[PDB]
Ligand binder design. Structure first.
Ligand SMILES: *C(=O)[C@@H]([C@@H]1N=C(C(=O)O)[C@@H](S[C@@H]2CN[C@H](C(=O)Nc3cccc(C(=O)O)c3)C2)[C@@H]1C)[C@@H](C)O
Length: 267
């Protein structure tokens, strides 16, 4: 009945802002889960940057890449919303810095560069997700072109469930060895675009790592988080939403509220 009451509350929340909410949440302490629309498809927007960063660290682990190698891009015309890469245009960035910047500031320039030189583009990102047993994730287009969030379009979609499972394998599981996993968590923990989402839903002495996404279209926005509650097993929370009309803006408070709902469902 915990589950059944959670679902009523998500459902009321989606009708209220005239839109569509997708939730999956995991207490690793118990295996307890809660999903609502947890197998429907939802645009990734920038949220794949979170996986992007994990792919880089996987390649560093494998020694196909060096975390401190210099990534020069001085001639590039940087994509809109590259606020870290603009500042190092002239001098370059270590790979590690570039990849965390993609993660923690949603730096599109960092993203496309990484996906063009190191990752095999959208298909290689999809390949990485497959390699950890994610059959839902698909990235189709490059950083700026994948936020059309057309209802019914499968390009650049995953499912809340897929997203959470994957976050679990990557953040908490055994995809990354100990040293590398630690860095991945630190990167998540320092994300700077997520204050009004899953972060706003948890006691202020919980530690959170997250990656957001904001399509700017169809009011589409998402967050997913690893949460370390005070003296208990980590939780995973995955929240995706969209809305009925192209012109609708996203809702931080809906994401925040749905997170609170999801966390009580599994608590
Ligand atoms: C991908 O979805 C997308 C990026 N990534 C974002 C994200 O992770 O949320 C979004 S929006 C996010 C909210 N603040 C930051 C920021 O750095 N700049 C900014 C720009 C306009 C308004 C505000 C504000 O009022 O705080 C903040 C961005 C972002 C659009 C794109 C690049 O595909």
């Amino acid at each position: 009945n915990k589950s059944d009451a959670a679902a009523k509350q998500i459902k009321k929340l989606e009708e209220d802002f005239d839109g569509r909410i997708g939730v999956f949440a995991i207490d690793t302490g118990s295996g307890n889960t809660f999903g609502y629309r947890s197998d429907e498809r939802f645009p990734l927007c920038s949220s794949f940057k979170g996986f992007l960063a994990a792919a880089v660290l996987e390649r560093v682990q494998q020694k196909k890449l060096d975390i401190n190698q210099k990534v020069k891009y001085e001639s590039r015309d940087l994509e809109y919303h590259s606020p870290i890469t603009t500042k190092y245009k002239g001098s370059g960035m270590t790979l590690g810095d570039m990849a965390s910047a993609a993660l923690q500031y949603s730096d599109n320039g960092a993203t496309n560069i990484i996906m063009e030189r190191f990752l095999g583009g959208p298909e290689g990102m999809t390949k990485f997700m497959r390699s950890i047993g994610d059959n839902e994730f698909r990235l189709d287009r490059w950083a700026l072109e994948l936020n059309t969030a057309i209802p019914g379009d499968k390009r650049d979609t995953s499912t809340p469930k897929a997203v959470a499972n994957s976050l679990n394998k990557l953040a908490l599981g055994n995809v990354l060895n100990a040293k590398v996993k630690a860095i991945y968590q630190n990167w998540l923990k320092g994300n700077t675009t997520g204050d009004a989402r899953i972060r706003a839903s948890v006691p202020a002495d919980w530690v959170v790592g997250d990656k957001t996404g904001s399509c700017g279209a169809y009011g589409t926005a998402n967050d997913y988080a690893v949460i370390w509650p005070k003296n208990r097993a980590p939780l995973i929370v995955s929240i995706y939403t969209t809305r009925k009309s192209k012109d609708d803006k996203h809702s931080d408070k809906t994401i925040a509220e749905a997170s609170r709902i999801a966390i009580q469902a599994i608590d």
